[PDB]
Symmetry: C3
Subunit: 314 residues, 3 copies
């Protein structure tokens, strides 16, 4: 099967600045040429060009509503499209808000897909519950069925069609959940493994459950939405939402690693990688590199080593 890399230099989900420089920093780090070396075929679709909706008045709290809406509309399209041609979609963020289009597009071509969301946050706050109007913290809401109608209609997000239900998604990493967000997830009984779960079970066990829970019955495609801030800041320091006590490098890789072995990786999102947010070059480097790492992991690089089939190295 083939891979399709899609840039998503967007940053209006987050109030900060620099995440759009994400895909570029990733590419820069050799992400493609590297992916190239795996047993997958690679094509760099480039970075979507985003048209900034002039005069994007805040729809209440929600800021840059239309700017984001249109942004995601394009992406969901490009994604859906390449998904249609059976290529696995890899989106390079850009902030997590772009998630909406990535999943939406995907859903179209693969509606039975499930979602593995790795992040310190749920990003499931609704236009109402957000304490900011930052959409990079409301992705799961627009995509969620159960949350349909449960909030007004934001300008530009008219095209979104809740494409998944709480029994289709699993969180991993959570450690900073807003009262609303918590309520919402505890109410809709959404399966997750906050750091406490992980601490109690061990990444290993966590994956097992995560997998049998989302794939026990039907073996549907898997959409991995990996928020860089999900790993402790000690590995993914360059982000806008750093939270202490998060997934270790090793844990993070184990996840991407196990998900590779499932052979069901259909869609991937590498988000919140914000180059400008680095106390030192190192940090920014460190981040990106693990970012790249995770990515290759998802695609077969194994901590246990790799060799080319049908080839006697002796």
């Amino acid at each position: 099967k083939p891979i399709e890399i899609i840039g998503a230099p967007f940053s209006k989900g987050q109030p900060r600045g620099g995440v759009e420089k994400g895909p570029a920093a990733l590419r820069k780090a050799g992400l493609v040429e590297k992916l190239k070396e795996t047993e997958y075929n690679v094509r760099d679709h480039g970075d979507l060009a985003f048209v900034d909706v002039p005069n994007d008045s805040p729809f209440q709290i929600v800021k840059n509503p239309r700017s984001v809406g249109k942004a995601n509309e394009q992406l969901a399209a490009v994604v859906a499209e390449t998904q249609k041609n059976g290529t696995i979609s890899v989106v390079l963020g850009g902030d997590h808000s772009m998630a909406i289009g990535s999943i939406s597009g995907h859903a179209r071509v693969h509606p039975d897909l499930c979602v593995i969301w790795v992040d310190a946050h749920t990003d499931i706050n609704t236009p109402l519950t957000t304490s900011s109007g930052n959409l990079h913290g409301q992705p799961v809401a627009f995509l969620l069925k159960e949350l349909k109608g449960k909030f007004p209609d934001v300008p530009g997000f008219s095209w979104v069609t809740p494409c998944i239900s709480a029994k289709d998604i699993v969180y991993i990493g959570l450690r900073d959940v807003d009262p609303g967000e918590h309520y919402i997830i505890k109410t809709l009984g959404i399966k997750y493994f906050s750091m406490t779960e992980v601490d109690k079970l061990g990444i290993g066990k966590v994956m097992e459950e995560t997998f049998s829970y989302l794939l026990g019955r039907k073996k549907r495609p898997i959409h991995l939405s990996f928020d860089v801030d999900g790993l402790d800041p000690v590995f993914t320091p360059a982000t806008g939402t750093p939270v202490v006590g998060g997934l270790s490098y090793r844990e993070g890789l184990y996840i991407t690693e196990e998900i590779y072995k499932t052979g069901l990786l259909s869609g991937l999102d590498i988000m919140e990688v914000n180059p400008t947010l680095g106390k030192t070059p190192e940090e920014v480097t460190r981040t990106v590199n693990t970012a790249v790492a995770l990515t290759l992991s998802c695609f077969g690089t194994k901590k246990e080593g790799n060799h080319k089939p049908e080839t006697d190295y002796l």
Copy 2:
């Protein structure tokens, strides 16, 4: 139920200097206002005022005997008192030596209480076995029944009445135990989980045993004596007794976290936080903040998120 915060700016247990600035650095870090936001009621009883016994000759090895004795006498009083009025006692150290009064006072109002001691050390060295005469390393001894008489009588500690037996306490973190201390704990068969145990079992399992072991039969109150140096120096760098390979942040929180869920937290001690001991402001900050973290954890903040009951955020 309500909370009672009691400062314990003491430092004569340790030979170093700066721990008395502990409670202040904690307070400073927003510890109260933060605690305030939990579903507990809060009252800051202030920082006991300690009278330095002029001319405190070393009772043999034991240094600043009377200075400490009187220090703890006051605390055990204030503690006992507020415990009586059913408020959960939170002591901010100050060095671990102050533990004696914190537990003693507590014992009075709740003698059936058990103790969860988190620390890299046992601090169970007797006036005889200590290699220094530093009392901040002899707390468990004065409080221990089994060790009653097993050593001379120190000036000022005349008031102490061994209030617990080796089947009432559990250590977690141990990784630097003196030959004596070891002997003593292995002799009196005291239950513990040194880092090796934790490595073998996983904080999760460790808590399970820790809980069924100390609460299997009777569901007594729980006295948590948390020594900041119990976490790897990578989180709690600002202390006088740093030891490598200790509880991670995540582990440390899991503990306080589980103990919160038991609903039996009766007494707490936040010790050895020594502001002056920081290679950089960061370290000192980092420490304090996790210190605060642990504390709030004990009181309901959950890595998995928090929302207010009977409130539709929608």
Copy 3:
């Protein structure tokens, strides 16, 4: 039983420079006097003197072939010798290439021995498969039976006699395996626990399997070849082959710790400790000290404390 410390200031296995200063930095750090304090007898055999074979032309890729061959010939001798007199052999590297002689000598006196290899690498690349000709990355190959003949004959390694088979060795730590190396290990079905395994199982479980796998049937001696780079660079920073996401300090100790408890430690190798490779004195210090740590662990120091038998400290 007694201990025999043998220096191996060698560095021609690695292209870098400084590892020969290893044993010295270790000694310097109190390694002996420390070991002395354990319930083992200690004798410092000194650091073998190595004669640099003048004009060591690269046998193809393999560099410094003869220089290394002769180096290991001496060691295998000294090792074999002291092993004969029933003393447990402790070799202080020096680069991992010296492993060949350490194991070889050992094998002679204890051919039924098994090997626990802790390292980020397999160092099982053959003169053919190496991408460099650096022998410090080919140890396991020369010692392996299955790999006998599977490659030309290197100058100076004429004396080596494949002394163990893939069912006698277990890797722990692996996270950087060359395509060849991988192939070779997956082909010969060699048991190992790469970081992914460890992440999935937990050092604890890993040791269990490691032990029942290598000692289930016969309780043979154990040869521990510990490559310093096996721990995350965050503890063992001073090495030529640092790899991210490796064994933690705690994990590393747990291993040496469990292996101590088996009572079967027959041979040990403390390698790749390269003093010159330190961004700061600290790093170099940090490394060495954990190096020493591991070592003492293997010999009875327990995170859970230590006391002298038949002695009432009361």
